[PDB]
Design a protein around this ligand. Structure first.
Ligand code: 9XC
Length: 245
């Protein structure tokens, strides 16, 4: 997250931190996700496509920090790793950049909800906010594009929905963007998601309800003029989400 502000897990209690085991026992951060039900986290397929084996991954919930334990957190193995059959990688774009992780603990359990651990609602079918709507994004990704390190503390910021007609322009992303994608950005290009934020939530207030409108997917740079952040448009995948769960 370029710009924005620091936060803790209580503000975004559905945020999931996804890590990978290494040969030689290193554990590195991979991607954010969102708890949509006690046993299901949702995320981006591109996060996992190079290491598509479930035993390599660990999911944490209720965790506000990258390399220290947060009081109250729950740790899971991935019982099930579901990548979208129609995934494709463009030069920038990712199509169908959506994945599901089934989580179960060493003791064999799913998430118990708490002050630090809650679910996020999914949108109603094909129902998105108007462009110009402010939504919020969360993740452990870089604070600047040049940074080598990821922040140790979870961050969030605000970006505004951009119309497809507008994202569709050349000047912008041209045809790279599709109707199964959304674009969002700061009017000044002052704040954005960046590397490390992929798979995390884009949450919008919809009918007085906090709703998972998008999943951080791609962009050209972070926080640059005419290069919004691109998000998997969740309201176009509900049957996929419903079937595989
Ligand atoms: C050298 O150009 C370049 N720079 C950054 C990314 C980049 N962007 C994002 C992202 O989400 N950006 C955004 N929302 N604005 C991401 N999660 N990860 C990445 N590595 C990239 O993509 C290959 N290319």
């Amino acid at each position: 997250i370029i710009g924005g502000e620091f936060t803790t897990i209580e503000n975004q209690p559905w945020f999931a931190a996804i890590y990978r085991r290494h040969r030689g026992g290193s554990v590195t951060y991979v991607c954010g996700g969102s708890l949509i039900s006690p046993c299901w986290v949702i995320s981006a397929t591109h996060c996992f496509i190079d290491y598509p084996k479930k035993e390599d991954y660990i999911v944490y919930l209720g965790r506000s920090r990258l390399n220290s334990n947060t009081q109250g957190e729950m740790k899971f193995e991935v019982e099930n790793l579901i990548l979208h059959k129609d995934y494709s990688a463009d030069t920038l774009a990712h199509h169908n950049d959506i994945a599901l992780l089934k989580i179960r603990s060493k003791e064999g359990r799913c998430a118990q909800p708490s002050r630090t651990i809650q679910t996020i609602a999914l949108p109603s079918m094909y129902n998105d906010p108007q462009f110009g709507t402010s939504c919020e994004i969360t993740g452990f990704g870089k604070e600047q594009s040049t940074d080598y390190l990821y922040p140790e503390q979870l961050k969030m910021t605000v970006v505004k929905l951009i119309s497809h007609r507008e994202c569709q322009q050349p000047h912008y992303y041209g045809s790279e963007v599709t109707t199964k994608m959304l674009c969002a950005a700061d009017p000044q290009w002052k704040t954005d998601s960046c590397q490390g934020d992929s798979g995390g939530p884009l949450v919008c207030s919809l009918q007085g309800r906090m709703t998972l409108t998008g999943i951080v997917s791609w962009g050209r740079g972070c926080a640059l003029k005419d290069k919004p952040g691109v998000y998997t448009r969740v309201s176009h995948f509900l049957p996929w989400i419903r079937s595989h769960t």
